[PDB]
Design a protein around this ligand. Structure first.
Ligand code: AHN
Ligand code: AHN
Length: 222
């Protein structure tokens, strides 16, 4: 098969939590792209025909850790139906640059990790899918809140809201939101409940008061 690039020792958080090698390659059979996560020569996870089976993929910031970045993907199905939770991995920026240099993909004097992100995004497009990068012209933002007892990060992206990354990770299409309701309103915090077109209600609690304006604006976006 035709291997395009590989990254070793990537920290995968979902749908399993292991350090794994990432291989991106093109199928022998029809040229469609494949990603597999390897431990030795064992395939722990594989997703075929990424041009058909990736529903959404994005690079996302890691709160308070500018030296790292998440690569997040949702998929329709995977090899042997092993998993359903989204792929989330953590890349160390400097590590990634160094591996790209060793593979000959970037010159040794390149210092900007955004060159790695550009290469990976172009590779997706050449193979027929898209990886977004909303935090590098619509303004995306993220904040910490709770779903019940579990803390997590709520990312507001141009067409999606994501709450992560404890199981089960939540992705909502922005165009599916019908309304927002605020409750438990206090000086420092409030709760917001997003109701979707299908009538489902998603409640996020203990959101900082400073986030109200951006969230209220986001839901009213025309
Ligand atoms: C070790 C870590 O925190 N994240 C995955 C490390 C990495 C970055 N690039 C390749 N591997
Ligand atoms: C809720 C939201 O972010 N957007 C509604 C419409 C839209 C599409 N792209 C940007 N805005």
């Amino acid at each position: 098969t035709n291997t395009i690039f590989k990254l070793e020792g990537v920290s995968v958080l979902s749908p399993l939590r292991k350090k794994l090698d990432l291989v991106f390659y093109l199928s022998n059979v029809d040229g469609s792209p494949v990603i597999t996560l390897l431990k030795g020569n064992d395939r722990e996870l594989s997703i075929y025909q990424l041009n058909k089976n990736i529903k959404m993929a994005s690079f996302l910031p890691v709160p308070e850790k500018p030296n790292l970045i998440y690569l997040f993907m949702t998929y329709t199905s995977c090899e042997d139906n092993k998993f359903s939770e989204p792929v989330v991995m953590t890349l160390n920026k400097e590590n990634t640059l160094n591996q790209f240099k060793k593979l000959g993909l970037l010159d040794s004097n390149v210092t900007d990790f955004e060159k790695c992100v550009e290469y990976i995004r172009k590779q997706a497009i050449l193979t027929g899918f898209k990886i977004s990068n909303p935090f590098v012209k619509i303004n995306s933002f993220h904040l910490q809140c709770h779903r019940g007892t579990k803390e997590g990060t709520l990312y507001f992206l141009p067409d999606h809201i994501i709450f992560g990354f404890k199981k089960p990770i939540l992705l909502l299409d922005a165009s599916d939101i019908e309304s927002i309701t605020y409750s438990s309103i206090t000086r420092l915090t409030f709760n917001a409940s997003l109701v979707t077109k299908d009538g489902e209600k998603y409640e996020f609690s203990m959101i900082d008061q400073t986030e109200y304006a951006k969230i209220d604006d986001y839901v009213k976006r025309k």
